[PDB]
Design a protein around this ligand. Structure first.
Ligand SMILES: Nc1ncnc2c1ncn2[C@@H]1O[C@H](COP(=O)(O)OP(=O)(O)NP(=O)(O)O)[C@@H](O)[C@H]1O
Ligand SMILES: Nc1ncnc2c1ncn2[C@@H]1O[C@H](COP(=O)(O)OP(=O)(O)NP(=O)(O)O)[C@@H](O)[C@H]1O
Lengths: 298, 298
């Protein structure tokens, strides 16, 4: 069939960590510290906390996905705590979602950064493709910032692990973010790693325009029509044709004609060696026991 | 028994790469470029080239090991070329072995670096332990420098993959580097991940003393005696007792009493957040298509 998922799901004791402040508000997210008992470490973590049998089902499914992945560019799940309300414990990503971050720092974001992020995101997604996993919701809002030099992919709430020989995923009805979806996805609810590539393309466009909304002001209703007309998102001001060309390819109607994440890594990597050649931006240039989750291993 | 090693051994065509200059001279090592055909990439690589049926056996065994590992802190094997003489193609590590590198740059090596290297090396070794692999030859001469901020473990010429339930490796006779070996290894040719920890300890000492030779001038003959006497390598000048304490533990006679690599990561990681507190050092502060192997994936 396929390989045995021997990932480990760690169950955390509530006494083991303390919420410190609120981060957001669905359920409710906190920043806090996890202190495994008897190890002298403190780990900055994000804690996500009515009780719907359906809602629990979803969060548990997400936990399942996150627990099955391990990559420097994908969010790491530390554990779950099974209190009346289930809590997801993940690594704390200090600078929040990348979409809010390019918006809030446009005047300090250089080409070196933009290209590095495009590279890391492709590495993340290429890893996911290796693990035969399709994200289905890749977008700037779904990439968190550990540091300005290190981003990771998140929000596995829609991800699907393709079965043994299943190569497309056929969803059957849902509330999906249409502006980041491939055309096959919109017309036939078919999802693929290549479908992901399309969203990667739109994601890159969000970064290149410092946070602009795709098809701003265009009802999702018609988005589908537009794409068939042969239309696409416009070339961002800072983008040399080289970069834009890559986006446009991520948006070919023939999915097999789009590039592979492993190719996206090489291309954006090359451009990252000489940033200024590919992106033209104005003026380019107690806690003694705190340990980052990236250094805390089982 | 255990999991199926589905790693991929890539066989490279000789036409596909060119040696550019000599790096060292056993057989002979070169720096060159690998250009997969039809991909527009050029990859800086190291090429290692009488023909002894025994010698081939060894290099092939090494290739086997290197092809089975994948970690940011372990050397990556790109492929082998089966010409009259077998050639190993690995990623080019520009700054050479770390032992030569701390020697050649003592006056520019700060605590931030030393501690980061101790961290990366522990991550490498912890990864190897996860892969049930025992290195048996960890030492500063066996760590290469990709950049001053990124080192990787190498030389798998002695490594052993422990069998299904085999937990010690019992070698049967060899030319082994005694000054980096655990006491059980010297007296009983027994090797363990914990045995590796001992060598990690000596390795760290080499870094902390900027390249000094362990037990300088003491015949390997007696090394064994000394250790039983309760003696060990001396505390390096720059080492706060905190750091030295860690080395000393890597050298406990009871192997299970030594720390685990995953613990070594946490400890040196913590110290890396405030370097100056743990190490006291004087004055602490064409090729358009070139792609680093770390960005070239299958
Ligand atoms: N690990 C984390 N570290 C720091 N911030 C996080 C982390 N996880 C989530 N956040 C932020 O917490 C807030 C809510 O996150 P999330 O659970 O994705 O809800 P959302 O995407 O903002 N809205 P919704 O999709 O309706 O639940 C957002 O600011 C997230 O970016
Ligand atoms: N991938 C590499 N990149 C750069 N330098 C390398 C690489 N691999 C090996 N070298 C260097 O090439 C020279 C020989 O390497 P190696 O094959 O380990 O022989 P050695 O350890 O120096 N001597 P020996 O153990 O007797 O073969 C040394 O300077 C190595 O550090």
């Amino acid at each position: 069939g396929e390989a045995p998922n021997q990932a480990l799901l760690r169950i955390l004791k509530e006494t083991e960590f303390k919420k410190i402040k609120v981060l957001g508000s669905f359920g409710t997210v906190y920043k806090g510290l996890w202190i495994p008992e008897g190890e002298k470490v403190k780990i900055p973590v994000a804690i996500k906390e009515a009780t719907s049998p359906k809602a629990n089902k979803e969060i548990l499914d997400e936990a399942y996905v996150m627990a099955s992945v391990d990559n420097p560019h994908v969010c790491r799940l530390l554990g779950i705590c099974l209190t009346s309300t289930v809590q997801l414990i993940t690594q704390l990503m200090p600078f929040g979602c990348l979409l809010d971050y390019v918006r809030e720092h446009k005047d300090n974001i250089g080409s070196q950064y933009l290209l590095n992020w495009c590279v890391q995101i492709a590495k993340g997604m290429n890893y996911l493709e290796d693990r035969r996993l399709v994200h289905r919701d890749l977008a700037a809002r779904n990439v968190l910032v550990k540091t300005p030099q290190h981003v990771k992919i998140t929000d596995f709430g829609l991800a699907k692990l393709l079965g043994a020989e299943e190569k497309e995923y056929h969803a059957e009805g849902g509330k999906v973010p249409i502006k980041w979806m491939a055309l096959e996805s919109i017309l036939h609810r078919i999802y693929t790693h290549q479908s992901d590539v399309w969203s990667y393309g739109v994601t890159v466009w969000e970064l290149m325009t410092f946070g602009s909304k795709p098809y701003d002001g265009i009802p999702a209703s018609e988005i589908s029509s537009i794409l068939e007309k042969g239309e696409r998102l416009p070339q961002p001001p800072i983008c040399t044709i080289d970069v834009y060309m890559i986006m446009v390819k991520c948006w070919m109607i023939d999915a097999d004609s789009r590039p592979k994440f492993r190719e996206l890594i090489i291309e954006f990597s090359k451009m990252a060696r000489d940033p200024q050649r590919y992106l033209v931006i104005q003026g380019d240039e107690d806690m003694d026991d705190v340990v980052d989750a990236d250094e805390y291993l089982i």
